[PDB]
Amino acid sequence: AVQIGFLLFPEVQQLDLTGPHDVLASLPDVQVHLIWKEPGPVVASSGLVLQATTSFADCPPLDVICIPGGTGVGALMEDPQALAFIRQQAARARYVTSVCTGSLVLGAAGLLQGKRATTHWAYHELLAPLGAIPVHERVVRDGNLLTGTGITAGIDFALTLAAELFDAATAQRVQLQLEYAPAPPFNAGSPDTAPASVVQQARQRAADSLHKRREITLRAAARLAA
Amino acid sequence: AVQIGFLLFPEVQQLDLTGPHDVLASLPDVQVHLIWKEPGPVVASSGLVLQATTSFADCPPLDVICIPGGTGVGALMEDPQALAFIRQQAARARYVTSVCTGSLVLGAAGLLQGKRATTHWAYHELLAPLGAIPVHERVVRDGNLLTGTGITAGIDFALTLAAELFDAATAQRVQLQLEYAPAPPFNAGSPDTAPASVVQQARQRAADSLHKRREITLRAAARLAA
């Protein structure tokens, strides 16, 4: 059975996790884990309550690890227990993946040093100090590392993982079973396509968070320099 | 504050709910409810554990009600307490919405009689016996009723609801904040675009479920005929 694990942390952006979870849980011979320090309730940034299924110590060796993003990323970038767990699992995993600001956690763990990667558009400047080669593309692969942008990046790259772990026909079957064919009613999902006025509103609303994450990123980078 | 409610039931397809939940919970002056018979744990079809926040009796009058789909729809189509709650809320709601097989629950409640509607492709034949005018389109509006197909239909129609409840700039801002710009790596999300071999595999895997839901649908239709 393929072992797939998601890190589930307080103030996660739950859709970053719940999207790929439902797709990958549709596959035969897959066991999916929601990992935190102990099993039990974890509250997402919206207030949605999720349940972690396993502790760090009890988690099996994973074939796929996925780090979601969210508000809670800032704390996770300076959580030595979480970072050590991610490094341990990444050593032997077939795929190391992240959604949105989850790539900043991979960066804090030292797993982006010399690697091409992306993250959420408003935080993209934080990749270079963590040793990454920043790339402005929605899905960036570098060896066994996949980083994706967008709250639903994990749905799309879950279909890629299904095709590689199984075969294309299996991925196509899951897509059809889920009738997955998105058609957004607006075209404002990138700072390159949204109106300039909207980009300004979004940048101003992210400014306090970016300021705090500049400070955290520099401390995380200092630990990597040691 | 706009009151938005999702029905949360055992064996729900959780992404049908968790997608629109995260989008709508991003909006100012919105309270989102997860409704079941009592607050507490509800297990999705994948095994993911969610928590209902309110009972039927305690739920405020809703501006938006959303019925997700999933395995668990069959039981809900013959749950008189759930159907009565949906009818009560639909009477005064500004929007009555469903994702995937959630429209079969609206059908069992009598809310599709004479209305254009869609549902999951494998179950589409069950709409006509529930009094609907079946339409093969991904999002179908008829007055205040929106029915959508695809596990992520609710993400897309949540942006439409945001634009109508607030304004287009608000919907565009939420889309940009979430960097929502899907790009599936396969084109098999419709029986019209998937390979014929894949459509056969998917139809054969749905056959037992369809057979059971034919039986349930006929009993539900008999109750509407009374």
Residue numbers in the entry:
A (entry chain A), B (entry chain A): 2 to 227
Give excerpts from the publication.
Here, we address each of these questions in a study of diffuse scattering from crystalline isocyanide hydratase (ICH). We selected the ICH system because it diffracts x-rays to atomic resolution at ambient temperature, has clearly visible diffuse features in ambient temperature x-ray diffraction datasets, and displays large concerted motion of an α-helix that is modulated by the chemical state of the active site nucleophile. Upon formation of the catalytic thioimidate intermediate, this helix becomes more mobile and permits water to enter the active site and complete the reaction.
Engineered mutations at residue 150 (e.g., G150A, G150T) also favor shifted conformations of the helix to varying degrees. As expected based on these structural and space group changes, G150T ICH superimposes onto WT and G150A ICH with a larger Cα RMSD of ∼0.8 Å. In general, the CCLLM values are higher and σ values are lower for the Refmac5 anisotropic ADP models compared to those refined in PHENIX. Considered together, the improved anisotropic ADP CCLLM, the lack of change in CCBragg, the lower values of σ, and the more typical distribution of anisotropies for the Refmac5-refined and rescaled PHENIX anisotropic ADP models show that diffuse scattering data favor anisotropic ADP models that possess more plausible features even when the Bragg models have similar Rfree/Rwork and CCBragg values.
